[PDB]
Assembly symmetry: C2
Homo-oligomer: 157 residues x 2
């Protein structure tokens, strides 16, 4: 549904890490997703890496996987990864953590802004916190019904 | 070392509450609860329903599978290739059974819908880091203060 897509973007904003990769090329690796305003997931990386070199010629079909317990967001997304030369996006998603890795600032020659546009994906969202979890377990013994911790669906972006 | 990074994977995987599991060439990865013990490493165990796609997918026999992990609290990130299969091991079923499993399956561990799945990793690209707590904040702050890149941790492609 539309609410599941809006909830995905809302919770993705606080997700510190995710597993990114180009389809048919190696395995997935940990990356720091950046989002603000929705539409795409943005990443800062080195030009010498396999992901940077893989999207040098053009946009490639890619995969991005999220599994965050803190936010309760679980997603396997199919999409498109590409190198972005956008100055505004680069400046927006630059941070104090990024400066530690790249000593030359946001305009460092080794810096590479990747843009992941999701196409579709299977998403699970954990509605409620520990309070609902505690209630659903108590309810499970009272009713013999399986706990409903949230929504689950396959979405087209 | 390769063996040292492998030992540390099993060491931290116990505290990982969730992971993304799936059979290769069949749908997308879905969230599952990995149950392991670092005293007996080698396999990652999952308790699921017989009516699910993962259960039905491995009913005929063992199938190539993928298990992806990404945990900031433990600093364990891994994309693993392996084999998923049905297990009729009552010892493993009883060891990894929990209060959460009682909620989903009203008839205990000997419930008709209960299905124990065993994922044996073959290989994978694993990253081990200092986490995202006190040490991570210090390491980023120290990187700025010394003109050195942060010493996050180790990364390698491992064969189990
Ligand atoms: Ca669109
Ligand atoms: Ca341990
Ligand atoms: Ca232990
Ligand atoms: Ca510096």
């Amino acid at each position: 549904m539309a609410d599941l897509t809006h909830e995905f973007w809302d919770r993705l904003e606080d997700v510190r890490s995710g597993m990114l990769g180009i389809k048919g090329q190696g395995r997935l690796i940990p990356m720091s997703p950046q989002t603000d305003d929705p539409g795409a997931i943005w990443f800062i990386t080195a030009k010498g890496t396999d992901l940077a070199k893989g999207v040098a010629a053009g946009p490639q079909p890619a995969q991005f996987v999220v599994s965050d317990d803190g936010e309760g967001l679980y997603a396997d997304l199919d999409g498109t990864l590409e190198r972005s030369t956008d100055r505004e996006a680069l400046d927006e998603f630059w941070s104090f953590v990024a400066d530690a890795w790249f000593d030359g600032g946001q305009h460092d020659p080794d810096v590479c802004l990747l843009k992941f546009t999701p196409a579709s994906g299977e998403i699970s969202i954990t509605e409620g916190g520990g309070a609902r979890f505690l209630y659903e377990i108590a309810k499970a013994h009272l009713t013999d019904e399986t706990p409903d911790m949230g929504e689950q669906a396959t979405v087209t972006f």
